[PDB]
Amino acid sequence: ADEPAYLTVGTDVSAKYRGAFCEAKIKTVKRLVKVKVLLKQDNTTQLVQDDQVKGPLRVGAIVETRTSDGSFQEAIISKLTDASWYTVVFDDGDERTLRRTSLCLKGERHFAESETLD
């Protein structure tokens, strides 16, 4: 898991702050997906990661997910929202979990201003 699972660990990146760039260094890589599940019984929808969701990651698939009750109920995927936690260490020595969207990798200006979700 502490491997190039999406991107790579140890890599220096820039993270967006309020439309500006800050440098950071990838401490941990977490490849997770935010599965929008909807419980078949309680009809409640939630958006939780594939660690909470036991089963295939397919929209319209039947899985079991951890409800806020701590129980695992059989649910259906209604969406999978991409996610990744790059725990990046900023020059301050602080490391915070940033979703890939905040990571600019090198820092070329197609972030901060530009971003078409591509």
Swiss-Prot record:
Transmembrane segments: none annotated. Residues 1-118 are annotated as: DNA-binding. It is found in: Nucleus. DNA-binding protein which modulates activity of several transcription factors including RB1 (retinoblastoma-associated protein) and AR (androgen receptor). May function as part of an mSin3A repressor complex. Has no intrinsic transcriptional activity. Plays a role in the regulation of epigenetic modifications at the PWS/AS imprinting center near the SNRPN promoter, where it might function as part of a complex with RB1 and ARID4B. Identified in mSin3A corepressor complexes together with SIN3A, SIN3B, RBBP4, RBBP7, SAP30, BRMS1, HDAC1 and HDAC2. Interacts with BRMS1. Interacts with RB1. Interacts with ARID4B. Interacts with AR. The function of the Tudor-knot domain, also named chromodomain-like, is uncertain. One study suggests that it mediates binding to lysine-methylated histone tails, with strongest affinity for H4K20me3 and H3K36me3. However, another study failed to find any interaction between this domain and histone H4K20me3 peptide. This is AT-rich interactive domain-containing protein 4A. It comes from Homo sapiens (Human). The lineage of its organism: Eukaryota, Metazoa, Chordata, Craniata, Vertebrata. The chain holds residues 4 to 121 of 1257 of the full protein.
